[PDB]
Amino acid sequence: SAHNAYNAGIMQKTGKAFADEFFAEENQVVHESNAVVLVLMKSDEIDAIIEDIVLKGGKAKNPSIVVEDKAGFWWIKADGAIEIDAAEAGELLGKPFSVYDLLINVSSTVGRAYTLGTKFTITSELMGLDRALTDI
């Protein structure tokens, strides 16, 4: 749910309350996270994918997804993995759309991201170490 919000946890605090937790001793080492962050650049194609793929079928299969509006881009954070099938996006948009066309407006990935077939996947898994990459 709301653990994936941009302003989750410490980010809600201001002033001295923020400082106290920012400098707390337990927060001086990294904490492993199972999340991934996906940034999508705003555009006609992306706004349709967001509303009709990510926020419908996507959130139905991964309820942890949070989408936030950052003016020029969409900020997306979810547990585990996010997957976007370029072939489904093409059907939605009514025009040819390969995985390489989808990447025209995929702007950032915090996670392990890869292309296989028509599918773009960003996953918390350590691809190439824990699970091998494959060909078509």
Partner 1 sequence: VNRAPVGVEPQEVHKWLQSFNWDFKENRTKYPTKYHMANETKEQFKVIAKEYARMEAAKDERQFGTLLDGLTRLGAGNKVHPRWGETMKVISNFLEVGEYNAIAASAMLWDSATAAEQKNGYLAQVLDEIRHTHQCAFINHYYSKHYHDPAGHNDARRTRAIGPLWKGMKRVFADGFISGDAVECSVNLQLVGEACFTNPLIVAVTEWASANGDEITPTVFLSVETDELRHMANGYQTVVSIANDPASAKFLNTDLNNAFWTQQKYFTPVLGYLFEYGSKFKVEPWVKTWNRWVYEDWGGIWIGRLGKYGVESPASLRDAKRDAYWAHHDLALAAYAMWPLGFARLALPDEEDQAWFEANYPGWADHYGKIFNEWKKLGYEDPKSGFIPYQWLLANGHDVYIDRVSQVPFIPSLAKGTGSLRVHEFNGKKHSLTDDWGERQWLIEPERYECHNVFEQYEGRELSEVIAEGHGVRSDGKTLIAQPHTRGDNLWTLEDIKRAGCVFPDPLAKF
Partner 2 sequence: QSSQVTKRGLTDPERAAIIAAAVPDHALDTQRKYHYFIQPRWKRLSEYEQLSCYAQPNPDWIAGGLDWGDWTQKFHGGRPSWGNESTELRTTDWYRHRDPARRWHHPYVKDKSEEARYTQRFLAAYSSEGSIRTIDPYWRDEILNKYFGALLYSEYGLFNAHSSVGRDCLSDTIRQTAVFAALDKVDNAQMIQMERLFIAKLVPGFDASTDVPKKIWTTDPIYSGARATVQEIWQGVQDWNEILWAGHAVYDATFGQFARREFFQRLATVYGDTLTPFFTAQSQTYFQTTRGAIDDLFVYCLANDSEFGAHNRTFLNAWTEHYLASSVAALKDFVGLYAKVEKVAGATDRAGVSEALQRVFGDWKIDYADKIGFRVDVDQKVDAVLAGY
Given the rule CB under 8 A, which residues bind partner 1? 6, 10-11, 14-16, 18-19, 22-23, 27-33, 35-37, 39, 41-45, 47-48, 70-73, 100-101, 103-117, 124, 126-129, 132-133, 135-136
Distance CA 57, CA 55 (A): 6
Judged by CB, which is closer to partner 2: 77, or 112?
Answer: 77
3-class secondary structure, 84: strand
Helix (H) or strand (E) holding 23: none
Residue 20 contact partner, candidates partner 1, partner 2, none, CB within 5 to 8 A by sort of partner: none
Breaks (C-N over 2.5 A) in the chain follow: none
Judged by CB, which is closer to partner 1: 84, or 105?
Answer: 105
Distance CA 18, CA 7 (A): 12
Residue 128, amino acid: G
**Which residues bind to partner 2, rule: CB under 8 A?**
2, 5-8, 11, 66-71, 91-95
- The conformation of residue 25, written as its DSSP 8-state character, comes to G
Least distance in Å: CB of 5 to partner 2? 4
Residue 92 contact partner, candidates partner 2, partner 1, none, CB within 5 to 8 A by sort of partner: partner 2
